[PDB]
Amino acid sequence: MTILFQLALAALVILSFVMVIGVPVAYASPQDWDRSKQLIFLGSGLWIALVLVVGVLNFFVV
Amino acid sequence: ATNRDQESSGFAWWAGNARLINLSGKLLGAHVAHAGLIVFWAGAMTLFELAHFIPEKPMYEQGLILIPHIATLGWGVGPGGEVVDTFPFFVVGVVHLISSAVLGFGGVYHAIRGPETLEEYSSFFGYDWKDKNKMTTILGFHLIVLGIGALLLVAKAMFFGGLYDTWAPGGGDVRVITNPTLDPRVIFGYLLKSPFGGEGWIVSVNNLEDVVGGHIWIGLICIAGGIWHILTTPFGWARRAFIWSGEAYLSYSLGALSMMGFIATCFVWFNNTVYPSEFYGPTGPEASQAQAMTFLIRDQKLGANVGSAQGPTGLGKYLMRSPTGEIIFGGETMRFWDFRGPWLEPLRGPNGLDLNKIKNDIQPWQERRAAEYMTHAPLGSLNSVGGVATEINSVNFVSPRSWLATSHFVLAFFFLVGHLWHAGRARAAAAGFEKGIDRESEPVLSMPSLD
Amino acid sequence: SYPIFTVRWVAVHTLAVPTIFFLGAIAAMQFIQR
Amino acid sequence: VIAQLTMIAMIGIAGPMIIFLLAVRRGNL
Amino acid sequence: TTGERPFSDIITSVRYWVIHSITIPALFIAGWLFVSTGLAYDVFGTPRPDSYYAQEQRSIPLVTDRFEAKQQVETFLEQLK
Amino acid sequence: KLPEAYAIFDPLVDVLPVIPVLFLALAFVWQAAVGFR
Amino acid sequence: ANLWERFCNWVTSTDNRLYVGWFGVIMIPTLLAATICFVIAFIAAPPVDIDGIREPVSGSLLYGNNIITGAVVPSSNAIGLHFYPIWEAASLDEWLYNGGPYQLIIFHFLLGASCYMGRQWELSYRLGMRPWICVAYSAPLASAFAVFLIYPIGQGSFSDGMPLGISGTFNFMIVFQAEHNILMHPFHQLGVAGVFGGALFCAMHGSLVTSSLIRETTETESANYGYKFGQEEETYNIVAAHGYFGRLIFQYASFNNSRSLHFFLAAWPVVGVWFAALGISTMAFNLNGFNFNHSVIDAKGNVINTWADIINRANLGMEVMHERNAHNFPLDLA
Amino acid sequence: METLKITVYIVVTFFVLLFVFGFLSGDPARNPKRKDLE
Amino acid sequence: RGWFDILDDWLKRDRFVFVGWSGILLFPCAYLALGGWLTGTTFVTSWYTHGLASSYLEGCNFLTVAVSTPANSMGHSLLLLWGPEAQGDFTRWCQLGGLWTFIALHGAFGLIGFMLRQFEIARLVGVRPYNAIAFSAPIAVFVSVFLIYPLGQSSWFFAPSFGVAAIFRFLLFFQGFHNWTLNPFHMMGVAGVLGGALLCAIHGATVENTLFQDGEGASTFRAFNPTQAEETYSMVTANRFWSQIFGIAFSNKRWLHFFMLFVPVTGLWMSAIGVVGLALNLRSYDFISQEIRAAEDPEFETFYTKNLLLNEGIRAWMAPQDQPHENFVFPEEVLPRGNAL
Ligand code: CLA
Ligand code: CLA
Ligand code: CLA
Ligand code: CLA
Ligand SMILES: CC1=C(/C=C/C(C)=C/C=C/C(C)=C/C=C/C=C(C)/C=C/C=C(C)/C=C/C2=C(C)CCCC2(C)C)C(C)(C)CCC1
Ligand SMILES: CC1=C(/C=C/C(C)=C/C=C/C(C)=C/C=C/C=C(C)/C=C/C=C(C)/C=C/C2=C(C)CCCC2(C)C)C(C)(C)CCC1
Ligand SMILES: CC1=C(/C=C/C(C)=C/C=C/C(C)=C/C=C/C=C(C)/C=C/C=C(C)/C=C/C2=C(C)CCCC2(C)C)C(C)(C)CCC1
Ligand SMILES: CC1=C(/C=C/C(C)=C/C=C/C(C)=C/C=C/C=C(C)/C=C/C=C(C)/C=C/C2=C(C)CCCC2(C)C)C(C)(C)CCC1
Ligand SMILES: CCCCCCCCCCCCO[C@@H]1O[C@H](CO)[C@@H](O[C@H]2O[C@H](CO)[C@@H](O)[C@H](O)[C@H]2O)[C@H](O)[C@H]1O
Ligand SMILES: CCCCCCCCCCCCO[C@@H]1O[C@H](CO)[C@@H](O[C@H]2O[C@H](CO)[C@@H](O)[C@H](O)[C@H]2O)[C@H](O)[C@H]1O
Ligand code: OEX
Ligand SMILES: [Cl-]
């Protein structure tokens, strides 16, 4: 269960970094806005999901 | 790239955000992103504080300013302000930090991706600064939001654990507020008190019932006012009194925030009710008084009659009269006799400090507290060497009251300056000479000479 | 089209060379322990 | 004390990196 | 202009950085070693932390004679055994 | 201290509060990239 | 037009030898009251118990002072921050003993000078000018606030406000250095950069413009007659002045733009002095100068003094001697 | 003292009112250019 | 067109950094003074002259490093590297404070160099030499404080040491020992510096707020051309504004700028005169009438007597460490102190 927690949190941090760099780059990029838009939706959903998972798993490792 | 150089916008890079004045979408972006910054610092700073937090050390020995704010709200602490559970601090931090991602997301979106102006997109979200109706409407929305916030404080205090009450009988403790002060005579009574010594205006509020009732009042007032400004448009006298432009509104708000900053400076410097000394350390007055107390206790233990001890000047060495007769601590701390604190008040009688109580009723916890506060007075250096300016290095300490007071004086000052700047400019721009004097129509040249 | 070793060049380096050396030294000093 | 410096290096580069990527891709700077 | 190459040109040129990505670190490291090897102490006569006082001494080695000051300092240094 | 589980992120936590400052500096990097036009 | 309308027109008239204005409506009586009370007190006020220990200090000329030693003495430490107007005293004699004049004067003055700033905005508006001269004035004004109001608030007594006199000013400075090590405070250092720099640039600008005056006069007349008030032509050659200064240092160190240059001239001392004011205003809450007392230590642990420690010894002299009968307990906590 | 206090209170109120009503009396319009600022 | 004239040609070439004949004096001396200060503050102690650490190498910071004056026992020795004290030994020379005289002297000649530069460039460009003339005040200050003052005293030791905190100490010493704030020449100095600052501020702000609209930009700096004939701001409006605000106003621009030269230059010159007095302990220390009254009357108190008590504290509490060559031992019981503190 702890493995799941640290997995999800490391994932959350990484994804956060990726989004931090990628979202403004995408927003200001001329080309490939459709796939980028899709990926921002995806990354956002996954980001919210990971926050909820880390949030729940918190109470099973602390 | 609309309006993103000096030639097209009229504004140089160093005034680049002035290019945003009539671009409501991008401006929305800037604001939501900034709110994101604020929330971000709240959360991040909280987590930083918590990581650096040793629970058995006083908060104020550890350079904390946010955890004290959380603790004052009743979260995480018990009798005497002892930390009994850090998890609420953790929650406050994490949740602010998570929320800042959302705000930053919306901000970046509106700022470099969304509609640059909102007016063609939405009549609801669009606005013209000169549209007094819309402006008072948005003002109304936000007033309602503020009222809701104040009511959240009320609800915390009355229905969700209560608040930390430094004045609680038997010692400081978290207490549920059940009978908030609703009497307007008291509430606005605070508003009509002198700001000078022994009065202190609203800064003098000294019980949680008054605080809670005040926020009930402020909440209703803000919601009512908000509805009012949604449903109305400025009256004629108002129209003729004000400048109606973005920069003007900004200037008004800057004035407001300058005022609030000064008020907060004084609040954290003098008040020990909503800034409990358990968490923030003793006030200046408090520590000075505490020194007097400490040596009265020491010398009286040694056999001194502190009531009759004449000091070198002829005034009492330990005890003297205030200009209106109350018995007060002697020495320089004569200036601080308006101080009131849970550790000192049991020695106070109707005529001030009571000699019999002083002789017979001083408890060990009072000695302790006076010693603690005397030795954590809000004095210290910029590199956080605690004590008077001549003290040697050894104690790593600057009071949170000092940090907060100084920071907010600096900010309030520069915000007053900003108010003068943007008010003067808004006037000049509205009248149309912010860019300089028209050579062919120089006003003074049409005026009679002074002599 | 432009010279390399000018009066300006000399001036610049009489300041810049010692400055970088000195900064190296002060850097080293930060790890000195009594 | 290594991880603090590594982290601030990653974050601290994250900023200029966006600008650089956009400048390269001739984006809307 | 006064005939020299613009600094903007120079510092943004590739060659400039080929040169100085060597020469600047070299200088920096040289100064670093000037301290870390202890040479600085001896060039300038600056006390190391253990050379301000002999073990039980508590009197500053103040120079008090103008013309035999040099010998006084030398004596003071010998006094650190 | 943070809950034990999160302790591995202590260095990261030490660095976070300064990030807002970086944004200010970023504004300048950005302006330099468009020549302060 | 009705009486009130006429009155408004006069108040805000651009044709009055001295502009009145609405800020002036407050400014004029408060400055008059502060001035009159100040002159009378400086000449004739009896000794004042500044430190509340029944040890009255003589400030006025008739009571043994000259121009250099004289002062209007701050109100009693017994008063602290209490409001002490004339009608709070049992008598004028009590009022004078307790330093009432000081409070009357500094409050009327702070109000009046604030309104002076406002009035600078106001006339700039009436004349069709740009508005920020008042922002420049905010710097000396903020300083005044710092030493007459904010520092007293922070320390809990107007007895610690700057005295209205020359020697009293020096007293305030020395005690300030004792209790805050202000010399080692970066905001005071920025203030020094502000006024030293202001003086430098004042002299520099003065000399550069004077150096490039265009010849319009003979050697037997003042060059000043070569300028006529309201002439449209600039009276000096800024290209020549820039040629000079740009060559004095190097070209890109010098301003070719007069607007840019004059903005610099405004900004440097104003910002510096803003920081001086903020320095006083924050040492008001005892966030003090850098303390490097005993910061250097040898291998055994012997203290190796630096110049900071010598400063510390001087400050100690000031601390132990100041207000020599006022302290009964070992720490000076305000 | 009470007469003095009443007197000063009346005075201060007088001037303060002059200030407020003064600035309420169409002040934006009191400039040399654009007067229509309502 | 012989070698002298060829050399003159080269010296006066219009390069990025102008050289000139004056450059031959200026650049080596300025370079050696700056370099000496940096060398000393980075690497050099003051143990043997003051009993002080004073370098980054020893652990001092920017505020506390200094190149300190020589020991009092050196008197006013030029303290040349090849002189009878150091005798050619670079290390001993550093230990004896050689860098202090090195910096003060190369600095003095550098200042001469710089003012000569001002004359030379003014002459070459065709302007009046008022900038050099104004620079005479920095000269007077440097020469009175770093040369005349210690020459009047026992030795170079009591000159200011070249460092931030060291200078702060110089200030406090002058208060405690000279009562320098009481000196009317210092007061004139203060009036000139603060008045200079005031003029700088007010003139800059006035020009910036009486600008003609000479462009369409809301940022108004671009609407100026160095070559333009017209005044860029309105002197008439400025004059009316200040006439109605302050009662009086400049009406003459030439007088305005000359005055801006005059105030701070004169102020600094006066302060110089005061320091020349302090070289001989010729102080404005006391008012004799004050002292006669106060000696006879133990209830007579003014801010003047208060400040003297402060001075007495400074002297007693700072002298033993500040003046180590005197070997002062002041037993606790003789230290002046008020109650409790
Ligand atoms: C809180 C500070 C702040 C904020 C919120 C803004 C916001 C804005 N500025 Mg201003 N500005 C600022 C400070 C700020 N500025 C400072 C300090 C200066 C002086 C250097 C300026 C000088 C300036 C000028 C001269 C101009 C602006 C402009 C703008 C607007 C458009 C920016 C743009 O299109 O660039 C495009 C930039 C990029 C494409 C690079 C990437 C930018 C994004 C925002 C980076 C996001 C990083 C972040 C970590 C991502 C998180 C993602 C995650 C949430 C998933 C925008 C609303 C412009 C304007 O008004 O246009 C109408 C304009 O011309 N600014
Ligand atoms: C309301 C503002 C505020 C206040 C009262 C505090 C107070 C404190 N902080 Mg916090 N903090 C803040 C904002 C604040 N901080 C911000 C914005 C950040 C992100 C940078 C942080 C991140 C942070 C960290 C990482 C730490 C603290 C710590 C502390 C404590 C020690 C402070 C210290 O030594 O400062 C040193 C003093 C300075 C650096 C001087 C600052 C002077 C500024 C630059 C002058 C600015 C003037 C003006 C704004 C400029 C305008 C220009 C003008 C021309 C207009 C103290 C309780 C320490 C602690 O003990 O935590 C437990 C600690 O480790 N803070
Ligand atoms: C806070 C200020 C604010 C304002 C005035 C706006 C306004 C707008 N946004 Mg923006 N936005 C914001 C913040 C804001 N947003 C934030 C925080 C995010 C990140 C989630 C975004 C991300 C975003 C995207 C991706 C888009 C917009 C769009 C829009 C436009 C359409 C709005 C609409 O029809 O929603 C309809 C309203 C609802 C569906 C109801 C909302 C229910 C709320 C969220 C419940 C919570 C309420 C509570 C008060 C929240 C408190 C938060 C506080 C504590 C911080 C409108 C101009 C659209 C646009 O610009 O199209 C061109 C669009 O595509 N926004
Ligand atoms: C964010 C807060 C806020 C803001 C910016 C506004 C703004 C406005 N209000 Mg609104 N209002 C608000 C909240 C707010 N309101 C709330 C919460 C309520 C319910 C209480 C109201 C109830 C209300 C009514 C009934 C009216 C307004 C009106 C107005 C307009 C003119 C007001 C004016 O001239 O003020 C300037 C203030 C004055 C002229 C008051 C007299 C001046 C004295 C000297 C002020 C002295 C105060 C002193 C310095 C403060 C110290 C503390 C004090 C208690 C001692 C303006 C758009 C007017 C309007 O046009 O409505 C359409 C109007 O008739 N408001
Ligand atoms: C517009 C603009 C700008 C600005 C911008 C901004 C200001 C932005 C912001 C943004 C933001 C504001 C963002 C934010 C973000 C956040 C995030 C991304 C977060 C994340 C988090 C996390 C991931 C967490 C984690 C954790 C947990 C959960 C638990 C505990 C621990 C830890 C912490 C690890 C500029 C100036 C540049 C310029 C251009 C324009
Ligand atoms: C919460 C709380 C409380 C309460 C509070 C309250 C209740 C408050 C209120 C408040 C208020 C009730 C406020 C008000 C304010 C106001 C103001 C601040 C005003 C302003 C005005 C102005 C600014 C104007 C101006 C002008 C003039 C003067 C002239 C004409 C023109 C114009 C308009 C410009 C208490 C303390 C109990 C306790 C604690 C808690
Ligand atoms: C919370 C969190 C997070 C977030 C993060 C962030 C949000 C970041 C951002 C970041 C950033 C936002 C960064 C930035 C940076 C910047 C910089 C680093 C800059 C610098 C600058 C400079 C250095 C400048 C320079 C200059 C120029 C450019 C021009 C002018 C001159 C001068 C020199 C000033 C993550 C994801 C980790 C995950 C975990 C948690
Ligand atoms: C003495 C002598 C000599 C000389 C030598 C020399 C000449 C040297 C030089 C040296 C040098 C030449 C050095 C330099 C150094 C530099 C440095 C060490 C720097 C540092 C810097 C910094 C630290 C920076 C800072 C800052 C500022 C300033 C502002 C902005 C920001 C910042 C913070 C970045 C001879 C041999 C003849 C002989 C014997 C004696
Ligand atoms: C653009 C700016 C670039 C700046 C680059 C800065 C690079 C900094 C690298 C840090 C490396 C630290 O490496 C450090 O080296 C020094 C030796 O010199 C060691 O220090 C050692 O020497 C000193 C004396 O010189 C002893 O008093 C100390 O007790 C001992 O540990 C440290 O044990 C080691 O931690
Ligand atoms: C304690 C502070 C007092 C707070 C009082 C708050 C009152 C709120 C309502 C104020 C009503 C304002 O009423 C204001 O006064 C008079 C009324 O004849 C008018 O009178 C003015 O009109 C024009 C306006 O261009 C002026 O040129 C003229 O000098 C004057 O007669 C103002 O134009 C009007 O707007
Ligand atoms: O009063 Mn004026 O001086 Ca401010 O510290 Mn405490 O108190 Mn007093 O002694 Mn130090
Ligand atoms: Cl005391």
Side-chain angles (χ1 to χ4, degrees), chain B residues 351-411:
Chain B
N351 285 350
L353 296 179
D354 196 292
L355 191 53
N356 277 324
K357 285 176 178 164
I358 281 173
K359 286 181 177 187
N360 304 294
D361 296 344
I362 299 176
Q363 306 307 298
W365 69 267
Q366 287 172 296
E367 176 169 350
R368 290 202 297 281
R369 187 72 55 71
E372 172 73 8
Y373 285 174
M374 167 191 168
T375 52
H376 291 79
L379 288 75
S381 72
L382 189 56
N383 50 327
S384 291
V385 181
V388 298
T390 55
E391 187 60 274
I392 60 175
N393 267 276
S394 271
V395 174
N396 197 178
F397 175 76
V398 162
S399 179
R401 296 190 182 272
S402 284
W403 286 123
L404 291 166
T406 61
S407 62
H408 284 84
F409 191 95
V410 165
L411 297 163

Side-chain angles (χ1 to χ4, degrees), chain B residues 6-7 9-15 312 317 425 432-439 442-445 447-450, chain I residues 209-222 228 230-237 239-240 243-244 339:
Chain B
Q6 163 139 205
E7 352 281 322
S9 76
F11 290 107
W13 69 266
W14 43 260
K317 196 184 296 174
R425 199 186 180 275
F433 43 82
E434 85 279 23
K435 303 177 176 179
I437 296 160
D438 179 358
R439 293 180 176 269
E442 176 173 4
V444 164
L445 300 190
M447 294 170 186
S449 280
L450 295 182
Chain I
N209 289 274
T210 52
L211 301 170
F212 292 109
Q213 173 165 1
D214 283 337
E216 298 308 315
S219 296
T220 61
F221 292 100
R222 284 193 179 172
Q228 82 189 47
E230 306 92 351
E231 57 175 8
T232 190
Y233 67 98
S234 175
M235 186 73 180
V236 175
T237 290
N239 173 274
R240 195 197 190 84
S243 292
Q244 291 177 287
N339 211 46

Side-chain angles (χ1 to χ4, degrees), chain I residues 266-286:
Chain I
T266 302
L268 260 61
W269 266 95
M270 295 305 101
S271 71
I273 297 167
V275 166
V276 171
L278 297 192
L280 314 174
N281 293 331
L282 217 38
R283 306 149 177 168
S284 309
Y285 189 84
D286 48 12

